[PDB]
């Protein structure tokens, strides 16, 4: 059944069987449904719940023109890079939040889903780029990256490397090296007198 009053398919996002690599982070637009964010904010399921530009308690009291749910997997030490005004391999070359970000960053440890004896090498990140990502920009190119002044000619080697590197998610990794699943909810608010909404 489908009706505009049903609960948002947040299950499809949070509980998805597979996540996207952070270099090719997924974006799911959320429309025609009802949500209880106060239930998400108070869930112990999430070890990271940080909202920016709006308080989590009043998310249900506001009106939005659009809501996105971006998701990906990084390693645990990199969770702090999913925030405004951060730098690092993830914030510079994979997923960038704008300084005026309006929304929430949610993350939980997914060692029991994404780790694999011998290493799960599905999840990958961008290691080399010529310039930093603009906010909310996505670069999924796999062209040979050129370091030195010599041209690359589409092949790995001297000062010419593949731009992506795979995490090797093993269950016995340290927590900083364990996979974490991230959902980033960003909102675009209605221009309206506060009297309305």
């Amino acid at each position, epitope marked *: 059944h489908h009706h505009h009053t049903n609960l948002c398919p947040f299950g499809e996002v949070f509980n998805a069987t597979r996540f996207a690599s952070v270099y090719a982070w997924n974006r799911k637009r959320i429309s025609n449904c009802v949500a209880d964010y106060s239930v998400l*904010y108070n869930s112990a399921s999430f*070890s*990271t719940f940080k*909202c*920016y530009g709006v308080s989590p308690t009043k998310l249900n009291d506001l009106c939005f023109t659009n809501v996105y749910a971006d998701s990906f997997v990084i390693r645990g030490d990199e969770v*702090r890079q999913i*925030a405004p005004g951060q730098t690092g391999k993830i914030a510079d070359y994979n997923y960038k939040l704008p300084d005026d970000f309006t929304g929430c960053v949610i993350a939980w440890n997914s060692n029991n889903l994404d780790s694999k004896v011998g290493g799960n090498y599905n999840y990958r990140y961008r290691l080399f780029r010529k310039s930093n990502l603009k906010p909310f920009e996505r670069d999924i190119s796999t062209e040979i990256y050129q370091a030195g002044s010599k041209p690359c000619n589409g092949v790995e080697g001297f000062n010419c490397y593949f731009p992506l590197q795979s995490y090797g998610f093993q269950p016995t990794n340290g927590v900083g090296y364990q996979p974490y699943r991230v959902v980033v909810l960003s909102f675009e608010l209605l221009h309206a007198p506060a009297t309305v909404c």
Partner: nanobody
Amino acid sequence: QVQLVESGGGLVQPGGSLRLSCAASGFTNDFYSIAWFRQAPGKEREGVSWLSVSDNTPTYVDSVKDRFTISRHNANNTVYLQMNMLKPEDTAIYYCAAGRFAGRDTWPSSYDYWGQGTQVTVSS
């Protein structure tokens, strides 16, 4: 500018209480969050209680759930951690941290502002 001043620790017997205080000054608005990290001898920093100030939302780990109570007194701009039924396990250097967001995080690297912590030791 932003500075976290810390006090309230000491020695207590197993079962006693203790009141920690974290004084946050230099914040322009109430849109920040406070966390309490404790560092057992040799262990890493682990968070035990959180308070998002703008919306007044506390959070605890299960291990201190019914024993600790976090609150803020709006007058003195200070966040209090009431530690009751202390156990020898709770012995650690307790820190208070802060970040420019509304919410909570388990990763110390998500908090930009720290204060040299107070010692809490529980034995008999």
